[PDB]
Design a protein around this nucleic acid. Sequence first.
DNA 1: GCGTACGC
DNA 2: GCGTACGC
Lengths: 8, 8
Amino acid sequence: XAXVXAXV
Amino acid sequence: XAXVXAXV
DNA sequence: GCGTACGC
DNA sequence: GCGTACGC
Ligand SMILES: *C(=O)c1cnc2ccccc2n1
Ligand SMILES: *C(=O)c1cnc2ccccc2n1
Ligand SMILES: *C(=O)c1cnc2ccccc2n1
Ligand SMILES: *C(=O)c1cnc2ccccc2n1
Ligand SMILES: [Mg+2]
Ligand SMILES: [Mg+2]
């Protein structure tokens, strides 16, 4: 759920 | 030489 | 429920 | 000359 590299 | 994650 | 970010 | 960054 976090999006720092994927954002899901 | 770039440092975005290692910086060497 | 998945992976992006740079060159001295 | 190497790897850091977050949870809905
Ligand atoms: C987001 O909060 C989150 C948490 N754990 C995960 C595990 C695997 C893929 C995506 C995820 N996203
Ligand atoms: C993004 O691609 C990514 C990959 N791994 C991580 C680990 C911990 C925090 C954030 C991250 N983001
Ligand atoms: C920095 O400019 C730079 C370029 N290529 C590398 C290859 C391997 C380790 C570190 C590097 N740093
Ligand atoms: C830092 O850990 C890191 C790792 N791989 C990369 C690829 C491309 C640009 C920057 C990067 N930084
Ligand atoms: Mg892509
Ligand atoms: Mg460390």
